[PDB]
Write a protein that binds this ligand. Structure first.
Ligand SMILES: NC(=O)C1=CN([C@@H]2O[C@H](COP(=O)(O)OP(=O)(O)OC[C@H]3O[C@@H](n4cnc5c(N)ncnc54)[C@H](OP(=O)(O)O)[C@@H]3O)[C@@H](O)[C@H]2O)C=CC1
Length: 271
């Protein structure tokens, strides 16, 4: 069955599934991309941090058909320094006008991140990026920037996966037309082997992962899972051949913990 897409308040539209490009090293980046596209992967997403925009922009030579996301790193923040940052990402990536552009972290102690959003609202008023948004923002932080500059980011990317469901923030999100991208959507693989998922993947003749990748799907979550082993790739991507029930859905909802965070607390994270 054909895939799905999620759309944005700014009227653009992004496939609800895509490929993560975390870690995967610069020279194999090139390779792994094409290999992936050939699977029917429609979106790609990397970040500046990983420094494989070059490998992506070669990898995606003569594949404009595909939704390309990238993230402005923390040492490039402010107004004039972000515009600069964008051109160059666009250069290494090679698609002067990109699909999605994300502010990697707020870094609120660094206080320089609202400056950073104007630079963004600019790039879209120019129409030099298609769709702008952020990564790892809170209530406090988004409110702060929607009041400062009157435009909501289309997407805020955040940590989330069965053991952490930021339902507070997905309440705030939903109430501002904001799309919510899952970061580390398998809780780093803790759930690969969780026993609630050893029944629900049996049930539907699938592996534990897909089960969950789908969870994200059936929550309206743009999800961007990363593998290299192409067996996994086309596995992750084959998540439309089925569907789940509320017996299922409200059974993976019990997996949420208050303490389920595993990464930087973006309020407190220092780099
Ligand atoms: N500050 C922060 O916010 C934090 C960030 N991180 C970052 O997150 C990243 C960690 O990546 P990771 O946790 O591995 O990503 P995920 O949460 O996506 O973990 C899932 C892992 O499972 C594997 N996998 C993918 N598809 C399948 C499949 N079909 N069957 C079985 N296994 C599969 C993948 O590895 P494989 O390629 O082997 O398939 C993947 O690495 C790092 O960049 C790390 O620094 C970590 C902690 C905190």
């Amino acid at each position: 069955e054909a895939q799905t897409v999620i759309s944005f308040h700014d009227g653009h539209t992004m496939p609800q599934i895509g490929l993560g490009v975390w870690e995967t090293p610069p020279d194999e980046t090139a390779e792994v991309v094409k290999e992936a596209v050939k699977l029917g992967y429609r979106s790609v997403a990397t970040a500046r941090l990983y420094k494989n925009e070059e490998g992506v922009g070669k990898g995606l030579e003569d594949h404009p058909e595909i939704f390309l996301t990238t993230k402005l790193w923390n040492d490039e923040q402010g107004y004039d320094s972000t515009l600069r940052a964008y051109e160059e990402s666009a250069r290494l990536l090679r698609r002067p006008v990109l699909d999605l552009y994300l502010i990697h972290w707020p870094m609120p102690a660094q206080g320089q991140y609202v400056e950073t959003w104007k630079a963004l609202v600019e790039l879209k008023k120019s129409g030099r990026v298609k769709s702008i948004g952020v990564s790892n923002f809170e209530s406090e932080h988004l409110e702060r920037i929607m009041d400062a500059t009157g435009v909501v980011p289309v997407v805020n990317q955040i940590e989330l996966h069965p053991d952490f469901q930021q339902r507070a923030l997905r309440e705030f999100h939903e109430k501002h037309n904001i799309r919510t991208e899952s970061w580390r959507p398998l809780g780093k693989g803790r759930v690969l082997s969780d026993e609630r998922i050893g029944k629900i993947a049996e049930k539907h003749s699938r592996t534990p992962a897909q089960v969950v990748i789908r969870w994200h799907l059936q929550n309206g979550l743009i999800v961007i899972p990363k593998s290299v082993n192409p067996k996994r790739l086309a596995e992750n991507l084959d998540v439309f051949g089925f569907v789940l029930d509320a017996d299922d859905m409200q059974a993976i909802e019990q997996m949420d913990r208050k303490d389920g965070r595993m990464g930087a607390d973006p309020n407190t994270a220092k780099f």
